[PDB]
Amino acid sequence: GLVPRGSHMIPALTSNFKAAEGSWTATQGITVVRPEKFAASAQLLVDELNAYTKGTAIKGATAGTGIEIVLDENQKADLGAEGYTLTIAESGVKITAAAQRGAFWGTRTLSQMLRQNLTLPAGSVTDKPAYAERGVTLCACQINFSTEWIDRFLNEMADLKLNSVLMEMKLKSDKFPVANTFSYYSRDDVKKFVKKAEAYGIDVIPEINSPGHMNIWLENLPDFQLKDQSGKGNADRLDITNPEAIKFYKTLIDEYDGVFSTKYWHMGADEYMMGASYYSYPQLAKYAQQVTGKANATGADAFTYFINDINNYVKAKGKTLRIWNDGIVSTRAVTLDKDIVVEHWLGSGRSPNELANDGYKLVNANLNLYFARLSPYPIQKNGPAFLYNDPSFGVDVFQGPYSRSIKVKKAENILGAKLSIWPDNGVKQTENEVEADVYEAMRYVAQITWGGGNPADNPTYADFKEKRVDKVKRSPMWNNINRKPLEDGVYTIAQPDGKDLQLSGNASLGGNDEWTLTSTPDHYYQLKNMTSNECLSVVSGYKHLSTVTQVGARPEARPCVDVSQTFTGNQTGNVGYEERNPQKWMLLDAGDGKFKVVNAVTLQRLAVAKGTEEHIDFTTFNGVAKDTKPAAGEIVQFPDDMTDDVWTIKPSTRSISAIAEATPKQAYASKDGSGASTIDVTVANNSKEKVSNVVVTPPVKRGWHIDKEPKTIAHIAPGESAKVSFQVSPEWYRGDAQFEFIVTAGDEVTKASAKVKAI
Numbered sequence: 001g002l003v004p005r006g007s008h009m010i011p012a013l014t015s016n017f018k019a020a021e022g023s024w025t026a027t028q029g030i031t032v033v034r035p036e037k038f039a040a041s042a043q044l045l046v047d048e049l050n051a052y053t054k055g056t057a058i059k060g061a062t063a064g065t066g067i068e069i070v071l072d073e074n075q076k077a078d079l080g081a082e083g084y085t086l087t088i089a090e091s092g093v094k095i096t097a098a099a100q101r102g103a104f105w106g107t108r109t110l111s112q113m114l115r116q117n118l119t120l121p122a123g124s125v126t127d128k129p130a131y132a133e134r135g136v137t138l139c140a141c142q143i144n145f146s147t148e149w150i151d152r153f154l155n156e157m158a159d160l161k162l163n164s165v166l167m168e169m170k171l172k173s174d175k176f177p178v179a180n181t182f183s184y185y186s187r188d189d190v191k192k193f194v195k196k197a198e199a200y201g202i203d204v205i206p207e208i209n210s211p212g213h214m215n216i217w218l219e220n221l222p223d224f225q226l227k228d229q230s231g232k233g234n235a236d237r238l239d240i241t242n243p244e245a246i247k248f249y250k251t252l253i254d255e256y257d258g259v260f261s262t263k264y265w266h267m268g269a270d271e272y273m274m275g276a277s278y279y280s281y282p283q284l285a286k287y288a289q290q291v292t293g294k295a296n297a298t299g300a301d302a303f304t305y306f307i308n309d310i311n312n313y314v315k316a317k318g319k320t321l322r323i324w325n326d327g328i329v330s331t332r333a334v335t336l337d338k339d340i341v342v343e344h345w346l347g348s349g350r351s352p353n354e355l356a357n358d359g360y361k362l363v364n365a366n367l368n369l370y371f372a373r374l375s376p377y378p379i380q381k382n383g384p385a386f387l388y389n390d391p392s393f394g395v396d397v398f399q400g401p402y403s404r405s406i407k408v409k410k411a412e413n414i415l416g417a418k419l420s421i422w423p424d425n426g427v428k429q430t431e432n433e434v435e436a437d438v439y440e441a442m443r444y445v446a447q448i449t450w451g452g453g454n455p456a457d458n459p460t461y462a463d464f465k466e467k468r469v470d471k472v473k474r475s476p477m478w479n480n481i482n483r484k485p486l487e488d489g490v491y492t493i494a495q496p497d498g499k500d501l502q503l504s505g506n507a508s509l510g511g512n513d514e515w516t517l518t519s520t521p522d523h524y525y526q527l528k529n530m531t532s533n534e535c536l537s538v539v540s541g542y543k544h545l546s547t548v549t550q551v552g553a554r555p556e557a558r559p560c561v562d563v564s565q566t567f568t569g570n571q572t573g574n575v576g577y578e579e580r581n582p583q584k585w586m587l588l589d590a591g592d593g594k595f596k597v598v599n600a601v602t603l604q605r606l607a608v609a610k611g612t613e614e615h616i617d618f619t620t621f622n623g624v625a626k627d628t629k630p631a632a633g634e635i636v637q638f639p640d641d642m643t644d645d646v647w648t649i650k651p652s653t654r655s656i657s658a659i660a661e662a663t664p665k666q667a668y669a670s671k672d673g674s675g676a677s678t679i680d681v682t683v684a685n686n687s688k689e690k691v692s693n694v695v696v697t698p699p700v701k702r703g704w705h706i707d708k709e710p711k712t713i714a715h716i717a718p719g720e721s722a723k724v725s726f727q728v729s730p731e732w733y734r735g736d737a738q739f740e741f742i743v744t745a746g747d748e749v750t751k752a753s754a755k756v757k758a759i
């Protein structure tokens, strides 16, 4: 049994679990009884129950015994839209709610209990959320999040009763293909994860940030860029005075409408000038004074007029507008509409307390809950303890100027709070690192937004962590991929029924070539070409946030580096990410030995170009025109929706194998040879036929005395091995030195490398 009742769950229950006589045990005999409209919401619970009870017979059905889910509108006043009652009796479990959202949250509580013990104590509890929006900002912006990551993230949020995610992202545009710079998302891909969110009660709100931070949309559209008095544009800012540019944005709004089901639209409205001055663009002031009919209209007025126009437009679609609070500026002939939700993050401009007093609905998008890959925030550096343990902190505490905190007193106008996940540099961290980084903060934010504060039985953060965070494992359905399909080793890489893949400087469809896969702690792979001694990477091409976003970008060979470390929190010791992470690859089991190969941070698939693919990156980028079209047979990276190319990765078949090891690992210049390292190279016969006349050829290297002559082994039988040694001594060379030995047997050729430090 789980005793004390409900002391090991997140969020904690908001009222006490009343104990009753007896218990109830989940077995493979139970059923999840639920109405058909709730089938999709119950599927997660069904799958978890089968995981928990180590079987596969549990189903969701409209009749049966076990766990009953009842949706009863009559309970709307007592439970609200998200409250539930959980009842456990010897006879079974009953979850009651007024709507789907609340019943689902009930299944999360139930699952977390069964996650710890199959036998549950009898009793009942009513659980209700303190705030209506319990949120995350996910900037899938400029850089990309793999669809698998998002699917896992929806599971992460769902199990914690988080119900709101703002996803700043690019949806592949049908009408404006010239603006489809990667990152973008397939429409079907978004429909898929938006559908999962609907089943889990998660409100997915899209964001196209405007009228600033629009580099991703206007790079290839100079005519919609705001221009200086000298006529110079800048893809960062949309010309809000141009009619076709407003039409362009509004078309994007429409395009998003067909895949997002939310009632909200977030136009961003980060400060338009981004630190510049409106006077450098007098056509904004002139547009303002024309549209208001007032001569005293300012540039900030035009910014607010834009905000209001988009407000009316989304309102005509029955939607509600959302903006960041730093988009609320001082005006003259235009006043900001009041039916817009304000997400407050910056301690500047109109105070959040006065905004709430004036009727605005507020989200606490608190800067203390920020995550970034480039410059880590305090919550990453130190964990949430400095907030949890701060009794002057809570959902109702917003940030103010000069480090002051402001308690918004009209709490009823506070919708809730959210944490924020920003990239800033797409290669400093991988997405799987991000997924580890937010673990504690997701639980903390879930706790304070559902409960309205800390659990009463966890005085300090250390207690919350020991009794809850460390005890509540994730749902067994969180993980959705084989994180290490292939073990570390030597493999061949080729197309299904085609040539193999080779790489020296550039990569190409070669033939007869070995690779070495080395798994990484964040569940990626390093692919080392064992002939060229260089690693497959992606570093050359058009970029956003130091990450290659050019479609069709050309993988290339790069010096192999250390890929054994992963970095979260403070990222202590995180150097070399510019080479490390472009070298890392996700390998997705495609069945039958085939594998989708996706770069870890550019998130595009290793592909064989066809000569028939089209994209803007093939013709121009940011006003500068240059043709990069891949020809048929060229090796490239491609978004998921422009390729089915998978890759056959299989352990090597070669009949000969060579291994070279030196002794010592360090060598020093020597006139008697005492610092001379002897590199023993040993050849091994893998298959079943006597190999003869095996030639081992040593390398030749600047500043080293190496035995010049090759050695030959007369015979080696199947499953045997033979050994020959060459001596190396440095002269004026110092530092790391790779030694490549060539082994040739008949038509077959392989190499063996060794490393020696010259001191």
Ligand SMILES: CC(=O)N[C@@H]1[C@@H](O[C@@H]2O[C@H](CO)[C@H](O)[C@H](O)[C@H]2O)[C@H](O)[C@@H](CO)O[C@H]1O
Binding pocket: 139, 141, 142, 168, 209, 213, 270, 324, 345, 372, 422, 423, 424, 425
């Ligand atoms: C509201 C806010 O926090 N704004 C700044 C963030 O700017 C975002 O940056 C991403 C890429 O990193 C997109 O370009 C998005 O459009 C921007 O709004 C910034 O990322 C973080 C700090 O890293 O906070 C603000 O500075």
Ligand code: NI
Binding pocket: 003, 004, 008
């Ligand atoms: Ni316990």
Ligand code: NI
Binding pocket: 213
């Ligand atoms: Ni910025």
Ligand code: NI
Binding pocket: 521, 522, 523
């Ligand atoms: Ni992991």
